[PDB]
Enzyme design. Structure first.
Site, PDB file in Angstrom:
ATOM      1  N   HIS A   1      42.062 -20.749 -59.921  1.00 22.01           N
ATOM      2  CA  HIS A   1      42.425 -20.075 -58.678  1.00 22.01           C
ATOM      3  C   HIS A   1      43.839 -19.687 -58.528  1.00 22.01           C
ATOM      4  CE1 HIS A   1      38.129 -19.983 -57.284  1.00 22.01           C
ATOM      5  NE2 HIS A   1      38.136 -21.171 -57.866  1.00 22.01           N
TER       6      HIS A   1
ATOM      7  N   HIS B   1      33.397 -20.659 -23.871  1.00 22.91           N
ATOM      8  CA  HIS B   1      33.548 -21.758 -22.789  1.00 22.91           C
ATOM      9  C   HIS B   1      32.324 -22.603 -22.696  1.00 22.91           C
ATOM     10  CE1 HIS B   1      35.667 -18.790 -19.881  1.00 22.91           C
ATOM     11  NE2 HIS B   1      36.490 -18.988 -20.761  1.00 22.91           N
ATOM     12  N   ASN B   2      31.209 -22.298 -23.154  1.00 23.01           N
ATOM     13  CA  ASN B   2      29.972 -23.519 -23.221  1.00 23.01           C
ATOM     14  C   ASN B   2      30.574 -24.291 -24.409  1.00 23.01           C
ATOM     15  OD1 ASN B   2      27.393 -21.397 -22.425  1.00 23.01           O
ATOM     16  ND2 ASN B   2      28.678 -22.708 -21.089  1.00 23.01           N
TER      17      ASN B   2
ATOM     18  N   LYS C   1      31.380 -16.494 -22.858  1.00 16.92           N
ATOM     19  CA  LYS C   1      30.381 -17.544 -22.314  1.00 16.92           C
ATOM     20  C   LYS C   1      30.202 -18.443 -23.363  1.00 16.92           C
ATOM     21  CE  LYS C   1      25.993 -18.426 -20.506  1.00 16.92           C
ATOM     22  NZ  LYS C   1      26.732 -19.797 -19.984  1.00 16.92           N
TER      23      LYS C   1
ATOM     24  N   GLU D   1      32.793 -26.889 -23.200  1.00 18.08           N
ATOM     25  CA  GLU D   1      32.031 -27.961 -22.193  1.00 18.08           C
ATOM     26  C   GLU D   1      31.507 -28.845 -23.062  1.00 18.08           C
ATOM     27  OE1 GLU D   1      29.572 -25.362 -19.966  1.00 18.08           O
ATOM     28  OE2 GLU D   1      31.225 -24.888 -18.451  1.00 18.08           O
ATOM     29  N   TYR D   2      30.934 -28.355 -24.310  1.00 15.12           N
ATOM     30  CA  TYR D   2      30.379 -29.426 -25.181  1.00 15.12           C
ATOM     31  C   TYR D   2      31.113 -30.468 -25.513  1.00 15.12           C
ATOM     32  CZ  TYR D   2      25.742 -26.782 -26.288  1.00 15.12           C
ATOM     33  OH  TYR D   2      24.477 -26.547 -26.487  1.00 15.12           O
TER      34      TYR D   2
ATOM     35  N   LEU E   1      11.187 -11.823 -13.920  1.00  8.99           N
ATOM     36  CA  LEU E   1      11.059 -12.468 -12.435  1.00  8.99           C
ATOM     37  C   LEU E   1      10.724 -13.962 -12.762  1.00  8.99           C
ATOM     38  CD1 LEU E   1       9.393  -9.720 -10.415  1.00  8.99           C
ATOM     39  CD2 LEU E   1      11.763 -10.002 -10.891  1.00  8.99           C
TER      40      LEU E   1
ATOM     41  N   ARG F   1      25.174 -33.912 -30.972  1.00  5.75           N
ATOM     42  CA  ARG F   1      23.695 -33.590 -30.411  1.00  5.75           C
ATOM     43  C   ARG F   1      22.684 -33.708 -31.511  1.00  5.75           C
ATOM     44  NH1 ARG F   1      24.100 -29.633 -25.234  1.00  5.75           N
ATOM     45  NH2 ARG F   1      26.278 -30.206 -24.354  1.00  5.75           N
TER      46      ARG F   1
ATOM     47  N   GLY G   1      23.832 -21.871 -13.296  1.00  2.00           N
ATOM     48  CA  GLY G   1      22.573 -22.692 -13.106  1.00  2.00           C
ATOM     49  C   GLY G   1      21.605 -21.791 -12.268  1.00  2.00           C
TER      50      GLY G   1
ATOM     51  N   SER H   1      26.812 -17.869 -15.551  1.00  7.71           N
ATOM     52  CA  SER H   1      26.899 -19.384 -15.581  1.00  7.71           C
ATOM     53  C   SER H   1      26.912 -19.646 -14.027  1.00  7.71           C
ATOM     54  CB  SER H   1      28.134 -19.747 -16.041  1.00  7.71           C
ATOM     55  OG  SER H   1      28.692 -19.488 -17.251  1.00  7.71           O
TER      56      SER H   1
ATOM     57  N   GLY I   1      16.014 -14.518 -12.615  1.00  9.55           N
ATOM     58  CA  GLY I   1      16.232 -12.938 -12.583  1.00  9.55           C
ATOM     59  C   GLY I   1      15.779 -12.914 -11.069  1.00  9.55           C
TER      60      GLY I   1
END
Ligand SMILES: [Ag+]
Ligand SMILES: [Ag+]
Ligand SMILES: [Ag+]
Ligand SMILES: [Ag+]
Ligand SMILES: [Ag+]
Ligand SMILES: [Ag+]
Ligand SMILES: [Ag+]
Ligand SMILES: [Ag+]
Ligand SMILES: [Ag+]
Ligand SMILES: [Ag+]
Lengths: 466, 466
Positions: free
Chosen positions: B450, B185-186, B182, B189-190, B10, B286, B129, B127, B14
């Site tokens: 290799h 998508h974030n 999600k 946005e970054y 809560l 960042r 806020g 999403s 929430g």
């Protein structure tokens, strides 16, 4: 009827190490799950003191105590399977040494579990390949310090001997510290190879240089500050011709591979909050070149500028040289900042001055670049960044003009420079007293009410921006 | 005496969701581990149908079956603790919904474990806020499809309504697909936030533009193809004055934070082998913004060029607009290539055309850019890269001239452009039919044997290069 050390996993690496340990005067037992590979080694070891075994019980019972077992099996689940079957056969104090290229987090998980059963686990990074494994590799063992000292003389006798007569082996630290340093060193080599590849792309597609002039250029660069095993090998590579007296390096398919580590060190840097931009762009660069068929189709659909250079080519060649040396310096500055943060988070108490022996960068040759990294941290252990060390500081501030020019022409001519751009972007971001992150903080305060700090007033704030 | 759905946790997120669910006509039970916030919510829900509980036993018995429990507690281990305590009280067929910013790997673990106990688990990204959860959030639920259909009417009633009337909720896929989308998508946005930041950096540092010139510039761009929620708010941020009429965004300490997700999406792309250069550079940007004190001392030791622009400032500002749009396209291309690869490795059967509703980019406003992403994958589901879509392809091939000028001007002026340089490097490498990875393959063939492939003849080869 006992041997002093045993090896499990008799592929090319494990077989060569057992031969190396034997050539120093040690009695060695060997074992392989599939029996065809262990008796194969018996016929190749007619004169050597190699005692074959054909059961896990016989192999463990063949070793003197405290037993020293070198694990050279497949990385991942095959290693965990070998340990799980050895564990009920072992005694308190025995030493398991995983010499494979393991993710350090697996080494930490195993060293923690076997310690609860009174079993020592040493995760040892091995550099040198099959050739070095036979004659003398460089070793990064991590784990129980007491267990290392019990096997230090064996590792010392089999490891490479530097110019100073010093063994290329030292105790890195607890649990997965050894495999970690091995990973970071390889990640730094990822960056160097991408920066050398970018230097060759501009020498070829912009300066129009032959493979003879390209090879001579690297050999010239290896004589000065850029002295490294990679630069030296690069020159020889551009001189190995093929069927039609053509450069074989140009017929090789341009899809770079990776057996992990590259992914691992970048993931680790993201977890630690360390900006490993240059090594990460190098790992990403290998990703992009693997989509070869997708790239060939994109080339037919996406146009770009035609590379043209009308100026002095040989002075631009020198600018590429300064751009390569500076980007290499930022590579190490990020990589050694990553190692410092990792020792802090893992409580390893690492000595960065002791962790400057990277193999592909001139390990046994005692390359001057490596000793400058060691001395920088030796003289200032609390050094926050190699860019602030007086030597490297003096170079990147004078070489930045060359890097900026090389990056600018590269972008304007369509030759991608992910590593060169990352370096000048890193230097410009690290030296920036103010960054546009204040705008990011404002957006984050609006969208998620994440609050923000100010430059003039103390405290945290939230603002109704609309 | 039974409610239709329950909410645990809560805090504001929430509590807003419970109020959202209540406002649609549903009876809601609430519960919080520490009761103090629970009967603070009864004091704020006097007229609404909110039944408080004070034990997990009472909370479970207060819900009709199949029970629908929305988890809104602290991400990670508080969530695992609530689940571990809830499990012995639930019945077969009960539906747990975690609506926190959860790592999708935790959702996959929880969904697999709870399924063996006949318990449904829905990892749902949220999403918008705090105000969004109150009035209409964007929901990305993933898990059991039959369990989603049992809660679909509740989720549809509370979710935001796009401006075509449709509720921005849709079944993403099994287990962790919801939280995964999600995260991607974030991450997109970054990148857009860092590219907008680089755009603002050159408007101020290089073009010497005002703070109202900067504001009107972003509002001008928001009227064209670059229309997004982020750009529109960026214009409003530069109009927020303080007490002395100064631009408040210029006072915010330039230390950008992050609550994961950015790390997770770049770690994931590294695991998938997806070149996510632009998003990762923004995540690293960042990181660099955090070492503010270290950057300030670095500014006193590392010199760079003095930014100066002599030419047409308006002509260069339009190049920055084109550089921003193309760089945004290049980040979406990486982000959606990453989602296609993850649907394959996770067997999610994702329809990428339905996963273009990114919140901060204009999902509720049905931005023209997001519809071009949806149309690109609808017109061609097998599309491997958005750079190949006819609309985006014709834009990148025209706007590349402006992006190259913007990048080159930034490098020569010392203004760091990690995102701009990543985009043009990504464009040049993806369209390159031949990359200098052939040299990297030759180096790998020498150091680690290799082996390699050829361009002219098929097969695998190993060369002694000296
Ligand atoms: Ag050494
Ligand atoms: Ag090493
Ligand atoms: Ag040659
Ligand atoms: Ag070494
Ligand atoms: Ag060495
Ligand atoms: Ag929507
Ligand atoms: Ag979303
Ligand atoms: Ag303004
Ligand atoms: Ag959305
Ligand atoms: Ag939406």
């Amino acid at each position: 009827m006992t041997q002093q050390i045993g090896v499990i996993g008799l592929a090319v690496m494990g077989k060569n190490l057992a031969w190396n340990i034997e050539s120093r005067g040690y009695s060695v037992s060997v074992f392989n799950r599939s029996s065809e590979k262990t008796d194969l080694m018996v016929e190749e070891s007619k004169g050597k003191n190699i005692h074959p075994t054909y059961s896990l019980e016989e192999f463990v019972n063949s070793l003197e105590k405290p037993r020293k077992i070198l694990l050279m099996v497949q990385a991942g689940k095959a290693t965990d399977a070998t340990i799980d079957s050895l564990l009920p056969l072992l005694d308190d104090g025995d030493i398991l040494i995983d010499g494979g290229n393991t993710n350090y987090q697996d080494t930490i998980r195993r060293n923690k579990a076997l310690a609860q059963s009174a079993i020592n686990f040493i995760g040892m990074g091995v550099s040198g390949g099959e050739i070095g494994a036979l004659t003398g590799p460089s070793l990064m063992p991590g784990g129980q310090e007491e267990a290392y000292n019990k096997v230090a003389d064996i590792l010392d006798a089999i490891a490479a001997k530097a110019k100073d007569g010093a063994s290329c082996v030292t105790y890195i630290g607890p649990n997965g510290a050894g495999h970690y340093v091995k990973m970071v060193h390889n990640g730094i080599e990822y960056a160097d190879m991408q920066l050398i590849a970018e230097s060759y792309a501009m020498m070829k597609e912009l300066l129009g240089m032959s493979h003879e002039d390209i090879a001579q250029t690297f050999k010239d660069w290896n004589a000065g500050e850029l002295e490294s095993y990679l630069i030296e090998i690069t020159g020889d590579i551009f001189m190995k011709l093929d069927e039609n007296k053509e450069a074989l390096v140009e017929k090789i398919l341009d899809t770079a591979g990776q057996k992990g580590t590259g992914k691992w060190t970048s993931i680790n840097a993201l977890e630690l909050g360390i900006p490993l931009t240059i090594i990460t762009e190098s790992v990403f660069a290998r990703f992009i070149s693997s989509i070869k068929e997708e790239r060939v189709n994109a080339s037919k659909e996406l146009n770009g500028p035609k590379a043209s250079f009308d100026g002095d080519k040989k002075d631009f060649l020198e600018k590429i040289r300064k751009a390569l040396y500076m980007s290499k310096i930022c590579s190490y500055a990020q990589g050694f900042a990553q190692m410092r943060k990792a020792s802090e988070d893992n409580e390893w108490n690492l000595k960065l001055g002791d962790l400057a022996m990277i193999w592909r960068e001139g390990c046994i040759i005692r390359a001057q670049f490596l000793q400058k990294i060691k001395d920088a941290y030796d003289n200032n252990p609390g050094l926050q960044n190699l860019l602030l060390d007086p030597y490297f500081k003096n170079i990147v501030t004078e070489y930045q003009d060359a890097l900026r020019d090389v990056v600018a022409t590269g972008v304007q001519n369509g030759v991608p420079t992910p590593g060169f751009s990352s370096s000048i972007n890193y230097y410009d971001s690290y030296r920036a007293a103010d960054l546009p992150a204040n705008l990011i903080q404002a957006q984050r305060d609006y969208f998620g009410a994440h609050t923000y700090e100010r430059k003039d007033k103390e405290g945290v704030f939230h603002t109704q921006w609309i």
